[PDB]
Amino acid sequence: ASITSVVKTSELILKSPLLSKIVVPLAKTYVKFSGYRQLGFKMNDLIIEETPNMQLALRRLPPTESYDRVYRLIRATQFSLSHKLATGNDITKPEEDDHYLIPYILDVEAEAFEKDALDNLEVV
């Protein structure tokens, strides 16, 4: 699935009052049980990157964001191999779990999908 898809569906849910009332609390619990914050990751660090679109989005990260992501990946890898969890400031707090990558990938995919559409235009 494309990030575009995921974001659009999420926005449909967040619009509907009923839907958001039942989905938002579930989603927050899911994230708590997922436990990626206990390895000091932000959610976007987990997105599959071995794709042309994602490699292009990662190249467009500002250098600071890019250097910080590299450190979180190395740090999480060291927790993984040691079978330890983050403690203290290494744990990602909910307020730090920012969608730093989502805007870049949405722009990459926007162009990719427009190109697909326009490759199939029919002069009327």
């Binding site: 722009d107 162009e111 427009e114 326009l118 235009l121």
Partner: protein, 402 residues
């Protein structure tokens, strides 16, 4: 070109009998107004990137469906954005320019991946000609800043996205924008610009930081890719006689396989060198230049001496025949410039953005031999000669030798 005003924007159009229309937005945003070096080149290259209503991709794909074309260039005075299309497609092009001026998303990736690399290839292609380099170097020596700023973006001084965004905030404003329509019905254009450019900021007139100051000097750009030499003379009072003098002195041949009958053309006999005199009016100052390119530094040096002699000889005496030849060559140069869409747009752009009424080719003044010789005399007796040498600079002349 019937000059009018539509929603605070100056619009000039001339209807014709052709299926082809040219619409140009002329912006007061050339390099003399550049906040940081190279920003006006970068802004020019940022035109027709992603806007909020329409992506660069979507624009290009739709332009191909109309068979339209896009031309952009930067001068010392303006940025010119020109589109060429079929007459009927005028509303689309007006709306496209509106999107560019109102709603360009200046995104960092566009700067890094699209805009800056294209600007760099643009410059490298220009510099392949050593005469381009020599004439650019000469303006830099003569004016230092303002007119002396580089027109093009260079690698040594990088333009940032914040630099370009700030400059665009100044330039993309009703006070700095003129619309020029060749083969466009003038009433129709006013109606469309009046609806499309209504919500553009008013802004303020962009100005040159500091007054134009003239300086003499030397520039020695060592390259390995050809040889050239400009001899420029900064002019404090731009006068129309220098056009006649540039055309008189001449340099290029008017005939295949020939040298030419112009004094500067005759200076190149026995050498594989070319020469060209040019005069650049910038309103408040001017530059009279003679550029010589060739493969041999020895031959360039030889011609350079003959060139300065030619100018001195002209300051002595011009014949009536020669003065008439100057009037003819100058009227012709004026006419073809008003025809060429690139130069045309900037000419009316200057009339609209400043207030300098265009001199019609049919109204080009005839200068007597007295007036021409007097103009050449002032140049031969300049306190501030500029000499820009490009190539094997150890073998090219110096100002004090000339």
């Amino acid at each position: 070109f019937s000059t009018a005003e539509a929603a605070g924007v100056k619009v000039a159009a001339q209807d014709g009998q052709s299926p082809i229309s040219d619409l140009s937005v002329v912006l007061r945003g050339g390099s003399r107004y550049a906040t940081v070096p190279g920003v006006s080149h970068i802004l020019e290259k940022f035109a027709f990137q992603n806007t909020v209503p329409k992506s660069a991709l979507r624009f290009v794909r739709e332009l191909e469906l109309f068979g339209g074309k896009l031309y952009t260039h930067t001068t010392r005075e303006h940025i010119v954005l020109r589109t060429q299309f079929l007459k009927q497609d005028l509303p689309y092009f007006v709306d496209a320019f509106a999107n560019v001026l109102k709603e360009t998303k200046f995104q960092q990736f566009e700067l890094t991946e699209r805009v800056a690399p294209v600007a760099e290839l643009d410059l490298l292609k220009r510099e392949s000609d050593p005469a381009f380099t020599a004439l650019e170097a000469a303006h830099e020596v003569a004016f230092r800043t303002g007119l002396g700023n580089s027109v093009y973006a260079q690698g040594y001084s990088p333009v940032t996205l914040e630099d370009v965004k700030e400059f665009a905030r100044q330039v993309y404003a009703k006070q700095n924008v003129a619309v020029v329509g060749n083969n466009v019905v003038p009433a129709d254009l006013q109606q469309l610009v009046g609806t499309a450019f209504a919500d553009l900021q008013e802004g303020s007139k962009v100005t040159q930081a500091g007054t134009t100051t003239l300086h003499g000097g030397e520039a020695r750009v060592r390259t390995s890719t050809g040889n050239a030499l400009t001899i420029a003379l900064p002019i404090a009072e731009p006068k129309p006689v220098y056009h006649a003098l540039a055309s008189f002195l001449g340099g290029p041949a008017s005939m295949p396989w020939s040298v030419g009958a112009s004094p500067l053309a005759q200076a190149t006999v026995g050498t594989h060198t070319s020469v060209k005199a040019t005069y650049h009016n910038y309103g408040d100052a001017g530059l009279f230049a003679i550029t010589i390119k060739g493969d041999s530094p020895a031959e360039i040096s030889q011609v350079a001496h003959k060139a300065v002699q030619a100018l001195k000889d002209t300051g002595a005496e011009v014949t009536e025949e020669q003065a008439a030849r100057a009037y003819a060559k100058s009227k012709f140069a004026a006419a073809e410039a008003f025809e060429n869409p690139d130069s045309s747009a900037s000419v009316i752009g200057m009339e609209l953005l400043s207030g300098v009424s265009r001199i019609a080719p049919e109204n080009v003044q005839k200068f007597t031999p007295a007036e021409l010789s007097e103009a050449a005399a002032q140049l031969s007796a300049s306190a501030k000669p500029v000499v820009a040498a490009v190539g094997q600079v150890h073998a090219l002349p110096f100002a004090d030798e000339l």
